[PDB]
Amino acid sequence: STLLGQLCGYYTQWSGSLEVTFMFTGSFMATGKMLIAYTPPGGPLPKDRATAMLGTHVIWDFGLQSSVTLVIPWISNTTTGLVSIWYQTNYVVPIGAPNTAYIIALAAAQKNFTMKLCKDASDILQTG
Amino acid sequence: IIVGYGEWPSYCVNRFYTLDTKLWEKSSKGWYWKFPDVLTETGVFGQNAQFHYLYRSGFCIHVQCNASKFHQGALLVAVLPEGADGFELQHPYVLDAGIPISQLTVCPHQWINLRTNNCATIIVPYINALPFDSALNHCNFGLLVVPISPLDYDQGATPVIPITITLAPMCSEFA
Amino acid sequence: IIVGYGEWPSYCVNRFYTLDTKLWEKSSKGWYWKFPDVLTETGVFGQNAQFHYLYRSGFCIHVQCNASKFHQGALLVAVLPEGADGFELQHPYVLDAGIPISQLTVCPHQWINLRTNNCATIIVPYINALPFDSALNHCNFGLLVVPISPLDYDQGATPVIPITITLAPMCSEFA
Amino acid sequence: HSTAETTLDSFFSRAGLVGEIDLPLKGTTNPNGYANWDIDITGYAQMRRKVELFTYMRFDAEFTFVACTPTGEVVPQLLQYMFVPPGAPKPDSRESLAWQTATNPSVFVKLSDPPAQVSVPFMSPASAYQWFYDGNMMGTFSVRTVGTSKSKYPLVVRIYMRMKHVRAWIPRPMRNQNYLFKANPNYAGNSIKPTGTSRTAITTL
């Protein structure tokens, strides 16, 4: 659904770094913490919150900050890495505020991203 | 920031270890952790603790909690010399040792009042009658988190308040 | 000392690893080892080989044997690009690959003649068409030890001659 | 001397009765003429709560030996009073060879003398004595009456100790509940008392 994923459907080979931004859209009165982790290519998904903490991660607090960013290092070659979101604490809220919020994720590429070997791939989008 | 006994860690695994989250209710007694026993199973520090013969390290401890403006309560965080999910106090008035809790402020301590702050920080140097000991046979100190004034809220708010401990080893040796 | 292809290891577990002793008889064919496959199970190098994604390292290899002045024979030690107890050659004349052994001196090589010397030393740089590969899916080179002139002695002497391989990693990276 | 009585030199500063051994003429208390006594500082009943205000201590000790008849009478008897360091064997009988080993120092003294008095240094392998170990031998005094036969008098020997050159580290809360054991912080959990006294209402003096 991203524009990066649609433009690299016209090419064959690519390599570079990425960046993912998370945006918390709950109310002003809600607090809590999260754990966003990244696993390099080759290793599996972690089994629990404790082994994911032993690795590349960040703690994200709702009450202090509404946006966090995660720089993914080099992806390449047309397995892959994994990004997982865990609950550190529970979701704390006062009386009179809603119990459920949502997160919106935004993704782009860095300045060292390249593409090569063009290919007009046969899209599903057919004319009429 | 509290620097324990006016002294920094010094020479005679440099990352944050967020342990786990405790749940503070209206009927909690208190909790304690024993160091370095809390960390001899996780990560690179847990390997070098049980593969070497001598040990010397200082610490830096952060205690945090998050709540709304409709909650109330107070915690006393203290460090007293001599697993990773802690134990619960049975008799918090005598600290399970026959000594009163009202005199625990003679130790390196810090208050957490939910009306005012939400974080505590204590720096602990290396304390022993020897220059080097064993990490697996001798625990140096313990960390105490006791609610002096109990938690309260009105019905409909979140009944359970998170407490997270995160720590960082500082000036460690292994021999 | 032979420096392979006129080039030293360079940047883009620093100890000796004495492997095991082979036994050279009057009916031996030859042996081979695959690197880094020989060392992905022992020590600190065996941990960092299978816990990281990319790998880059050079080596230094010592081959030694000890015998009396009443023994005779010759070995050819060579390094050809592309467990810890080695494999045995079935057809040493074609090197188990359809290529002759009489042209193996186009590689980084060294002779061991029991009449003259008893030690060989070859330094190997990092060789790949890529700057980084996987230690567990790609073997870079192989080490060959083949007796060209066979072992001989008179009856009553020691019938079996030891051959020990010892190696040291040099300018290693892990990422 | 303008707050020189609250120092730790003055707070641990008097000779107190610790240890009292009895050498009866008949009975089963000490049937032969010898007795062993292990050096502890908590034989004085006010002393354990005072030293456990701290975690680590370091001091010297000075011992005094006064002896008499159960009535109080002074009789012409000669006694031995030897010191066994930690790591050395202790006597089993009166004919043991430990009574005449030259590395165990003795003090021969008559009973019609001033009391004998010696000094014992800091003898721990560590840098301090610690009263709390999450995971302290000073020696032994043996007391005998000199002779090959049994003495003609019943005797009582009392031991006094004064500490000196005192240093201390890391204060702790003081003891709140009654003790049950030695070198053991256990307490009676089925009867826990407040620290002080109570009143009827918070608004009444």
Say how far apart CA B168 and CA B16 lie, in whole Å. Answer: 5
* B contact test, residue of A59, A92, A99, A100 with most B CBs within 10 A: A92
Please name the residue that has the structure tokens 């003898």.
Answer: D123
Secondary element (H or E) of residue C43:
helix C43-50
Total residues belonging to chain D: 205
Q: First and final CA of chain A: distance in angstroms?
A: 23
Q: How many CB atoms lie within 10 A of CB D82?
A: 19
The rounded distance, in Å, linking the Cα atoms of C30 and D160 is 85
**How far is the CA of C48 from the CAs of A26, A91, B45, C40, in angstroms?**
43, 39, 17, 8
Sequence-distant (≥ 6) Cβ neighbours of residue A88 within 8 angstroms: A32, A33, A34, A35, A49, A59, B18, B21, B162, B164
- Which H or E run includes B50? helix B43-50
Q: How many CA atoms lie within 13 A of D84 on its CB side?
A: 20
Q: Identify the CA nearest to D112 among candidates D47, D68, D53.
A: D68
Chain A contacts of B17, Cβ < 8 Å? 53
- C141 neighbors C79 (Cβ within 8 angstroms): yes
Nearest-angstrom CA–CA distance, B101 and D172: 11
Q: Which residues contact B47 (CB under 8 A, 6 or more apart)?
A: none
Whether residue D171 is preceded by a cis peptide bond, meaning omega within 30 degrees of 0, is no
Contacts of D143 (CB under 8 A, 6+ apart): D21, D23, D34, D35, D37, D79, D80, D81, D157
The distance from CA D145 to its chain's CA centroid, rounded to whole angstroms, is 21
Structure tokens at D13: 């500063």
Cα–Cα distances (Å) from D60 to B98, D82, D94, D161, in that order, read 29, 18, 30, 10
Which residue's entry shows tokens 């790998």? C55
How are beta strands C2-3 and C119-124 bridged, if at all? parallel
Radius of gyration from C-alpha coordinates of chain A: 18
Q: How wide is the angle at C-alpha D42 spanned by C-alphas B95 and B126, nearest 5°?
A: 50
Q: Say yes or no for a CB contact (<8 Å) between A33 and B164.
A: yes
For the record, the structure tokens of B173 come out as 């040796």
CA distances for A128 relative to A73, A122, B123, angstroms: 42, 16, 72
CA distance D22 to D148: 19
Tokens read off for A67: 């946006």
Q: Which residues of C touch A40 (CB under 8 A)?
A: 53
Chains B, D in contact, 3 or more Cβ pairs below 8 Å: yes
**A–D contact (≥3 CB pairs within 8 Å)?**
no
Q: Which of A27, A29, A86, A89 to mutate to test the interface with B (most CBs of B within 10 A)?
A: A89
Question: What radius of gyration, in Å, describes the C-alpha atoms of chain B?
Answer: 17
Rounded alpha-carbon distances, angstroms, from residue C167 to C15, C35, C119, D205: 8, 11, 13, 87
Longest dimension (CA), chain C: 55
Among C167, C146, C85, C75, smallest CA distance to C115 is for C75
Q: How far apart are CA B111 and CA B77, in angstroms?
A: 6
Round to whole Å and give the CA distance between C25 and C11.
Answer: 41
Bridge partners for C145 per DSSP: C31, C77
Within 86-105 of A, beta carbons closer than 8 Å to B belong to 88-96
Say how many CB pairs under 8 Å bridge B and D.
60
Which residues contact residue D31 at a Cβ distance below 8 angstroms, ignoring those fewer than 6 apart?
none
For tokens 């570079």, what's the residue?
Answer: A16
| D56:B137 CB<8 A | no
Structural tokens at position C41:
């199970």
Please state, in angstroms and rounded to a whole number, the distance separating the CA atoms of residues D23 and D142. 12
Is there a contact between C45 and C13 (Cβ–Cβ < 8 Å)?
A: yes
Does the beta-carbon distance from B94 to D192 stay under 8 Å? Answer: yes
Contact D37, D21 (CB under 8 A): yes
Of B161, B49, B41, B43, nearest in space to A53 by CA: B43
DSSP tag of B124: E
Around Cβ D17, how many Cβ atoms within 10 Å? 13
Q: Is B105 helix (H, G, I), strand (E, B) or coil?
A: helix
* Cβ separation A93–B158 shorter than 8 A: yes
Q: Domain range spanning residue B19?
A: 1-175
**Domain count of the fold of chain C:** 1
Q: CB-based contact (8 Å) between B102 and chain D?
A: yes
A33/B66 Cβ within 8 A: yes
Residue D177: its chain B contacts at CB < 8 A? Answer: 94, 98
What angle is formed at CA C41 by the lines to CA C35 and CA C44, rounded to 5 degrees?
100
Cβ atoms within 10 A of the Cβ of A21, count? Answer: 13
* Best of C48, C53, C55 to mutate (most A CBs within 10 Å, chain A): C53
User: What is the distance, to the nearest Å, from the Cα of residue B80 to the centroid of all Cα atoms in its chain?
Assistant: 10
Rounded Cα–Cα distance for residues C158 and A128 (Å): 90
Chain D residues whose beta carbon lies within 8 Å of the beta carbon of residue B5? 170
DSSP state letter for B128 = -
Residues 45-84 of A with CB under 8 A from B: 50, 53-54, 59, 61, 63
**Which tokens belong to A103?**
């997160």
Residue A41 contacts C, CB cutoff 8 Å: yes
Contacts of B68 by beta carbon, 8 Å cutoff, 6+ apart:
A29, A31, A92, A93, A94, B157, B158
Burial (CB count within 10 angstroms: exposed 0-12, middle 13-18, buried 19+), residue B98: buried
All residues at 6 or more sequence positions from D158 whose CB lies less than 8 Å from its CB, including other chains: D17, D19, D20, D65, D66, D67
How buried is B70 (Cβ within 10 angstroms: 0-12 exposed, 13-18 middle, 19+ buried)?
Answer: middle
DSSP codes of every residue in C120-170: EEEEE----SSS-B-TTT---EEEEEEEEEEEE--BTB-S-EEEEEEEEEE
Q: How many residues does chain B have?
A: 175
Coil, helix or strand at residue B106 = helix
CA distance C58 to chain A (A): 24
Distance, CA of B70 to chain centre: 26
Cβ contacts (< 8 Å) between B83 and chain A: which residues? none
The Cα of D56 is separated from the nearest Cα of chain B by a number of Å equal to 8
CA C153 to chain centre: 26
Alpha carbon distance A26, A18 (integer Å): 26
**Cα distance from A96 to chain C (closest Cα, Å)?**
49
* Structure tokens, B136: 């697996």
Q: Can the peptide bond before residue A40 be classed as cis, meaning omega within 30 degrees of 0?
A: no
Query: Rounded to a whole number, what is the distance in Å from the CA of C173 to chain A's nearest CA?
Result: 17
Cα separation values, C60 from B22, C13, C35, C38, C112, Å: 53, 13, 12, 14, 17
Choose among D75, D100, D92, D98: nearest CA to D151: D75
HEC secondary structure over chain D: CCCCCCCHHHHCCCCEEEEEEEECCCCCCCCCCEEEEECCCCCCCCCHHHHCCEEEEEEEEEEEEEEECCCCCCCCCEECCEEECCCCCCCCCCCCHHHHCCCCCCCCEECCCCCEEEEECCCCCCCCEECCCCCCCCCEEEEEECCCCCCCCCEEEEEEEEEEEEEEEEECCCCCCCCCCCCCCCCCCCCCCCCCCCCCCCCCC
Report helix, strand or coil for C113.
strand
Alpha carbons within 13 angstroms on the beta-carbon side of residue C40 total 17
Closest Cα in chain B to D196:
B100
Distance CA B76, CA B108 (A): 11
Q: Say whether residue A40 is in contact with chain C using an 8 A CB cutoff.
A: yes
Query: In the structure encoding, which two tokens stand for residue C142, read together?
Result: 């192989």
Contact predicate A34/B18, CB 8 Å: no
- The reply to whether residue B18 touches residue A92, judged by beta carbons under 8 angstroms, is no
- Among positive and negative, which fits the CA dihedral A111, A117, A123, A126? positive
Q: Do residues A107 and A113 touch, judged by C-beta distance below 8 A? A: no
Q: Quote the Cα angle for C109-C113-C117, to 5°.
A: 95
The phi-psi region of residue D138 (left if phi > 0; otherwise alpha if psi is between -120 and 50; otherwise beta) is alpha
Give kind and range of the element (H or E) at residue B33.
strand B31-35
Q: Which residues of A touch C53 (CB under 8 A)?
A: 40-42
Q: CA C128 to CA C135: how far, in whole Å?
A: 12
Q: How far is CA C5 from CA A9, C35, C79, C100, C109, in A?
A: 44, 18, 11, 21, 11
Q: Does B137 touch chain D (CB under 8 A)?
A: yes
Rg (C-alpha) for chain C, rounded Å, is 17
Cβ–Cβ of D134/B82 closer than 8 Å?
Answer: yes
Nearest to A59 among B18, B42, B158 (CB): B18
The residue to which tokens 């009429």 are assigned:
A128
Burial class (CB within 10 angstroms; exposed 0-12, middle 13-18, buried 19+) of C119: exposed
In A, which residues are within 8 Å of B43 by CB distance? 54
Q: Which chains touch C (3 or more CB pairs under 8 A)?
A: A
Q: Examine chains A and B and say if they touch (3+ CB pairs below 8 A).
A: yes
Contacts of A15 (CB under 8 A, 6+ apart): A74, A75, A76, A77, A113, A114
Facing A89 at nearest CB: one of B21, B42, B157: B21
Q: How many CB atoms lie within 10 A of CB B58?
A: 21
What are the DSSP calls for chain A, one per residue? Answer: --HHHHHGGG-SEEEEEEEEEEEE-S-TT-B-EEEEEEE-TTS---SSHHHHHSSEEEEEETTT-SEEEEEEEEEE-----EEEEEESS--B--TTS-S---EEEEEEE-TT-EEES------S----
- If you measure CA to CA, which chain B residue comes closest to D127? B129
- Amino acid in position B173: E
> Kind and range of the H or E element at B60?
strand B55-65
CA distance B132 to chain A (A): 28
Report d(CA C122, CA C61) in Å as an integer. 5
CATH number at residue C155: 2.60.120.20
Phi and psi of B44, rounded to 5°?
A: -75, -30
Q: Using the 8-state DSSP alphabet, how is residue B99 labeled? A: -
Report d(CA A31, CA A62) in Å as an integer.
5
Could you tell me if D168 lies within 8 Å of chain B, comparing CB atoms? no
d(CA B63, CA B165): 5
| Token pair for B47 | 């390997």
Q: Strand pairing partners for B62?
A: B121, B166
- List chain C residues with CB under 8 Å of A41: 53
3-class secondary-structure state, position C76: strand
What contacts A34, CB < 8 A, 6 or more positions away?
A59, A60, A62, A85, A86, A87, A88
Which H or E run contains B75?
strand B72-81
Six-digit token string for B26: 């209206």
Number of A:C CB contacts under 8 A? Answer: 3
